[PDB]
């Protein structure tokens, strides 16, 4: 087990990605706190826990909402005495649209939620974390992080933008014993890419050094290794779960 | 001189290197539409080009309200006919406060210009330059769009957001005639970089590998020749004008 | 147990990084193949794994000599009957020197070592995993990988290099079956490292966002991860293991 | 004219992009020292310079040796009287070959030429820019510096290399009035892609968001412009001639 007794909390845990990430935490030992936006999936996520025997509360949060952020907080301690870990995971594509008929309506939405909410979440992370002598966050970024696609300058804006704070508070904090990266995966097998066809997703494989998509698992994998002990001298950093997409 | 005939506006460019860029802009023989949040300051700048004989007109623009980038458009069309060349250049620091202190208002505002901003005139730039066959952009990024600058979580985030949005741009306008690049200055003597303590300027000098500080017209320089013609093949890209500060 | 029934061999393995990363692939199951060009060094290792009942055999090898990775990966197959894992860890740091002052025995050196070593043995490494269906290799570069440090140009090159070698050869075999990644350790506490004046360590760690130095199992640890099947979804790709040291 | 009064050195100046460096150089006023392995071919480039009235000498140079460096800087002393600009553009691609089957000829003459090489002439343009204050050097690397290229591994850790070289040297002698730069091409209209077929030519226009290949000219325009006092706060740098390739 790599997180035995730590307590983790999880952004968008709902569905996806960040289900899977809620689960590996469990399975590797972590009390986690789930959140999301629905509390239907995220209800579901917390039994799913429960069901494979492991340690959890569910709490609502809207990532883009500041106030949220509190109520997770005081969440994980009440349930749990401290916060060692966190994961910003939640996020959304946003439409693919090129940039000059992007609305406003689409960028704040994207940067409110992709970008704006993983500060709020690492500022209320910091400052739980800071009372009991450090931790681990982790935030979800992209290969959007390091490169452009088209159609989703919002989405690219905001991701690169969570590679930048984290390379600050890495800096601010790490005096302090709390450690913060950021991943980056390329196309994973999510929604999205189940409703495209065959030969759109043949060409997003071929984008990859692997020929095929990540999975949800290969990514909770890398976060949980970034989450524990054995990372213990990893912080300020992008780790890509990318298949080798950047690589060229 | 590279931007003979050409049409330029720039954000920002009441004082520091703004001011510089839409000099250089005009001496380098385009019209430039000067615009700046302060009235006062975008003035100055323009009577500053008109005294040397340069063509020039001033129209406010606060980068962070989505309407005034359609004044500014609107003004370069009214003047000039056409937009060739946009610098978005407007930019503020925020204060260095740690993340954990950073309030929401500071987050909001250091985004709204840093980055939202960038892209409203982007936005409005992009759909300019279409009507007449294209164009070049340049945003002003930072250091910071590449590493951190503990104190200022929003500005780094803002300032990676800058480099993403230019590379998603770069890739959807790239066959419609349009370029957009990313310029990342180290520490500048504007008003008040010049005007620091002896002791502070001199932390500053030694992060950089030539142990000074920039200057304006060492920006300026950059941003016209990556406005011109000769920079043909150059777009989605990132030019820094660091003195060697990334590169340790 | 991240390893279990793998065999994978490690360069450079009788001191320092290398050695922690015999060990701790040991730790994890694997069987392994200890090398290095000091044979008292590398039976060291092997002594320390077979001391705690791990399988392992140790073979010499200097990696700048093409045929020594050909007895190498011989001395996998005789033992353990294939090879699942390599760690091109071997290297120097040169002396420093400044670059008007290198001597082409200084760069030759480094180059010969850090950098044509490593593909060599790359080279090897590939043609001996295919016969099995694949791989997992780790080459270690440095932070110098991503930035310089002055006195020693030939080491910042040639771990640029290694940086450059990883991302050819990810998309060259990623459908085949193997993945490799670089590693870019920050100024660990290897007995060099250890034992410099307390003024020196002090400098070198306020480098560091985590404000200390790493340990050999802070980098083991990360190695050995990349070389598991939990690292399915990565290859390409450049993992910083530096306390921060890059994100300023 | 950038380069009015300045003496430039040009390695591989006798084809190409170098000659076009050379011409470049020339027609902004610069005395130039056209060098390379191919006497014939670098004679024609200085007959071509004197034709259109520039100021220029030739002097062999095979990059990978040494004692020929010492040569250039010879004879750019005895014409000129000091160097104040190098470009190390000399360098040739490997053949298309499998790391695995990659020959040790192949990776020795590739790194020999595109890696030594550079070193070598740099270190002699240092020694050489310090007697007369400093100067500007700008290395030749490629995307190549920044991604790989499959089937060229040699070349991909090559140009790596270099990008590694630059940050080092810009540190050590930036107090000293050096500059150096390195600039990295896309795929630029020269004789390999002018003898592929249509097809593969338009697959490789469609990896540069300008979906066109480069002229050499385009190159030379930036190697001119970061030569030059306009580049005075550029150092230790990597500039993109890429047509956006590396923005996806
Ligand atoms: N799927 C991919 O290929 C991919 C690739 C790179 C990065 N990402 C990132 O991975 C993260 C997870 O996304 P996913 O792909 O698993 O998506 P998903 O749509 O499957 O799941 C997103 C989850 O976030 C929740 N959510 C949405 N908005 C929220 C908000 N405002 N506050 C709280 N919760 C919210 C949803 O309800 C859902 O449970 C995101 O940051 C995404 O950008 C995904
Ligand atoms: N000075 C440095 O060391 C440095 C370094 C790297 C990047 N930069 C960037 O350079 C750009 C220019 O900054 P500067 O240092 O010259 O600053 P400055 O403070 O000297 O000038 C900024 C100008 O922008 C104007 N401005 C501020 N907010 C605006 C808004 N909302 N809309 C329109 N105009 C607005 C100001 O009125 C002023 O004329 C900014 O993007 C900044 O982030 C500066
Ligand atoms: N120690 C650090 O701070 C640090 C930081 C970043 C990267 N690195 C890298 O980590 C790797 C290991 O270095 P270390 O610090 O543990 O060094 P070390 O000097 O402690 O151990 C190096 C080992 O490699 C062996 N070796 C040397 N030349 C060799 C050759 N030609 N062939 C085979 N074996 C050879 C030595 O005999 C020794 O056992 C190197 O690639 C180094 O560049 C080290
Ligand atoms: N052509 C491209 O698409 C491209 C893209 C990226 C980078 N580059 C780089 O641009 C530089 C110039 O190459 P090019 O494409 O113009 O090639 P080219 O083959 O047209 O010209 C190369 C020149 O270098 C000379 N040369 C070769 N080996 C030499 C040696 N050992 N010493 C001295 N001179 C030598 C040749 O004789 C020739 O004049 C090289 O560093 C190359 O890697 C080229
Ligand atoms: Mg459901
Ligand atoms: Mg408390
Ligand atoms: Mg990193
Ligand atoms: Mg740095
Ligand atoms: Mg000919
Ligand atoms: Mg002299
Ligand atoms: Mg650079
Ligand atoms: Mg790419």
């Given at each position: 087990?790599?997180?035995?007794?730590?307590?983790?909390?999880?952004?968008?845990?709902?569905?996806?990605?960040?289900?899977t990430i809620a689960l590996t935490y469990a399975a590797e030992g972590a009390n986690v706190v789930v959140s999301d936006i629905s509390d239907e999936w995220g209800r579901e996520t917390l039994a799913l826990i429960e069901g494979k025997g492991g340690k959890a509360v569910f709490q609502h949060a809207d990532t883009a909402h500041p106030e949220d952020h509190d109520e997770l907080i005081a969440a994980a301690k009440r349930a749990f005495g401290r916060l060692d870990i966190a994961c910003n995971n939640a996020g959304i594509s946003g439409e693919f649209t090129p940039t000059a008929e992007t609305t406003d309506a689409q960028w704040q939405r994207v940067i409110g939620i992709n970008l704006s909410g993983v500060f709020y979440g690492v500022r209320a992370q910091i400052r739980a974390m800071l009372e009991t002598g450090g931790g681990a966050i982790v935030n979800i970024s992209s290969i959007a992080g390091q490169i452009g696609i088209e159609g989703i300058?919002?989405?690219?804006?905001?991701?690169?933008?969570?590679?930048?704070?984290?390379?600050?508070?890495?800096?601010?904090?790490?005096?302090?014993?709390?450690?913060?990266?950021?991943?980056?995966?390329?196309?994973?097998?999510?929604?999205?890419?189940?409703?495209?066809?065959?030969?759109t997703r043949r060409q997003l494989e071929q984008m990859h050094a692997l020929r095929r998509l990540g999975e949800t698992e290969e990514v909770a994998n890398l976060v949980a290794w970034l989450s524990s002990d054995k990372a213990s001298f990893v912080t300020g950093s992008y780790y890509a779960v990318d298949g080798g997409y950047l690589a060229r």
């Open positions: 087990m790599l997180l035995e007794g730590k307590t983790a909390l999880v952004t968008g845990a709902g569905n996806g990605i960040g289900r300058t919002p989405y690219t804006a905001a991701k690169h933008g969570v590679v930048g704070l984290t390379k600050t508070v890495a800096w601010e904090y790490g005096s302090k014993g709390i450690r913060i990266n950021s991943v980056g995966p390329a196309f994973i097998n999510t929604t999205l890419v189940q409703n495209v066809p065959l030969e």
